[PDB]
Amino acid sequence: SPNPPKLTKQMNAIIDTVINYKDSSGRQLSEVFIQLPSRKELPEYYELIRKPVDFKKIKERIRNHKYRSLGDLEKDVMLLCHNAQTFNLEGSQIYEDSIVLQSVFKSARQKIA
Ligand SMILES: CC1(C)c2cc(C3CCNCC3)ccc2-n2c1nc(=O)c1c(Br)cccc12
Ligand SMILES: [Zn+2]
C-alpha cells in the first residue's frame, strides 16, 4: 500500500477547501491555524497541548503519503480543531472558528468523496 494518486488528489482538494474557505463576511477562518505559534510567543500552548498540529503539518503528511485513508486525515483535522477548543476560551472566535472548520471539512469530504 503506497497511496493511489486519486486519494492524494482528494485529500489535497478537501484540505485545500478547508483552508480557502471564507465566511459570509469574507474572512478566511483557517488563517490562524495554518502555523502553530512559536514556543517563545506562546509557551503555555505547548505545556497545555499534548499533540500540536497545524494545517502546514497536515499538508506535509498528505504530500508524504502518511495518511492511509480519508479517515486518518480527518483524525488530524479534528485534533487540530480539538487542540483549538482545548486551548482557547469557549465562545471565543478562534474556538468558534475551529467548530465551523470541523463542519466545512465534513461537507468537503462528501462533495469530493
Ligand atoms: C489562537 C492561538 C492561541 C494562536 C495564536 C497565535 C499568535 C497570534 C499573534 N500573537 C502571538 C500568538 C498563533 C497561533 C495560534 N493558534 C492558536 N490556537 C490554536 O488552536 C492553534 C492551532 Br490548533 C494550530 C496552530 C496555531 C494555533
Ligand atoms: Zn509521493
Q: What descriptive keywords fit this protein?
A:
113 residues; mainly alpha; Histone Acetyltransferase, Chain A; 59% helix; globular; binds ligand A1BF5; binds zinc ion; transcription; Protein degrader; monomeric; Isoform Short of Probable global transcription activator SNF2L2
What features would you describe in this structure?
- With 113 residues, the chain is mainly alpha-helical.
- It is 59% helix and 0% strand.
- It starts with a helix and ends with a helix.
- The structure holds the ligand CC1(C)c2cc(C3CCNCC3)ccc2-n2c1nc(=O)c1c(Br)cccc12 and zinc ion (ZN).
- The ligand CC1(C)c2cc(C3CCNCC3)ccc2-n2c1nc(=O)c1c(Br)cccc12 binds at residues 32-33, 36-37, 41-42, 45, 54, 80, 83-84, 87-88, 94.
- Zn(2+) binds at residues 65, 82.
Quick structural gist:
The protein is 59% helix and 0% strand.
Sequence-ordered SSE layout with sheet pairings:
Blueprint: H1 5-20, H2 45-48, H3 55-63, H4 70-87, H5 93-112
Helix pairs in contact: 1-3, 1-5, 4-5
The chain binds the ligand CC1(C)c2cc(C3CCNCC3)ccc2-n2c1nc(=O)c1c(Br)cccc12 and zinc ion.
PDB class: transcription
Keywords: Protein degrader, transcription
Assembly: monomeric
Class computed from helices, strands and strand pairing:
mainly alpha
- The helix-strand sequence is HHHHH
Biggest sheet descriptor: none
Shape: globular
**CATH third-tier fold name:** Histone Acetyltransferase, Chain A
Number of domains: 1
Subcellular location: Nucleus
Binding site for Zn(2+): 65, 82
Organism: Homo sapiens
Family: Belongs to the SNF2/RAD54 helicase family.
